[PDB]
Amino acid sequence: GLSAEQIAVLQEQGFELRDEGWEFGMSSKVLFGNNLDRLNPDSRNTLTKIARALLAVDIDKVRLEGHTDNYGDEGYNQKLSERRAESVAAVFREAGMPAANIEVRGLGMSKPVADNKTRAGRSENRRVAIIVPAE
Amino acid sequence: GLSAEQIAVLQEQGFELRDEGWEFGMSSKVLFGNNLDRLNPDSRNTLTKIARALLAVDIDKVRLEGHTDNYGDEGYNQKLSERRAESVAAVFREAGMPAANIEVRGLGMSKPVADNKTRAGRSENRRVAIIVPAE
């Protein structure tokens, strides 16, 4: 389980404890914009600070999951979700996180957090999740 | 939002982060034994240490929630669950927590955490939970 100086850091960064562990989503929109899986460089820093802060307190084990809405090919949403997840993973590596400690899952359309019949609904399902397991 | 020192103390007392806050649960058999809402001496002593720990790091509020299984009259089980939480509240108040910062709830049979079908799940649901709300 996580130590008190860690949990606090997680809380500070915007993490919320859920069933699979501590979770913090960012929208694809903010993360990539018009790109497919290239991060615009502002989101890169945002993702660097985050990773640096976590490693600072010996959190060094994260899972990254990316989802899409249901619009589009089913096969493509899987790849995209996985590639987009990996894009973020590469920023964690480049900051000091043991690659063996990073897990990457493409979850495609299958796992939404909103009704997929709204511009703010569908744009909410387009996201990448940062997960520290509470193990 | 709880600080590292607060969280540290919470973990040392056996609390566990849930959905409604930090939460330590004790079974009714331990707290009450054969009694109704009178705690046995060993329990009051335990509860007093927990209470003093929470005060010594300036915790803002505690909620005390009594639960039963689903055997018996539902209104009796509601009252009992309430009287039982009020027994734990009293110990808090006597340890120096002000009434106004203490929330007492009898929840009867409505929030189980185990299966009422077995003798075991029934004894597990017979508990009073101490919650520190997540501001």
Author numbering:
A (entry chain A), B (entry chain B): 34 to 168
The publication says:
The YfiBNR system contains three protein members and modulates intracellular c-di-GMP levels in response to signals received in the periplasm. YfiN is repressed by specific interaction between its periplasmic PAS domain and the periplasmic protein YfiR. Previous studies suggested that in response to cell stress, YfiB in the outer membrane sequesters the periplasmic protein YfiR, releasing its inhibition of YfiN on the inner membrane and thus inducing the diguanylate cyclase activity of YfiN to allow c-di-GMP production.
We obtained two crystal forms of YfiB (residues 34–168, lacking the signal peptide from residues 1–26 and periplasmic residues 27–33), crystal forms I and II, belonging to space groups P21 and P41, respectively. Each crystal form contains three different dimeric types of YfiB, two of which are present in both, suggesting that the rest of the dimeric types may result from crystal packing. Here, we refer to the two dimeric types as “head to head” and “back to back” according to the interacting mode, with the total buried surface areas being 316.8 Å2 and 554.3 Å2, respectively. The “head to head” dimer exhibits a clamp shape. The dimerization occurs mainly via hydrophobic interactions formed by A37 and I40 on the α1 helices, L50 on the β1 strands, and W55 on the β2 strands of both molecules, making a hydrophobic interacting core. The results showed that wild-type YfiB exists in both monomeric and dimeric states in solution, while YfiBL43P primarily adopts the monomer state in solution. The apo YfiB structure constructed beginning at residue 34 has a compact conformation of approximately 45 Å in length.
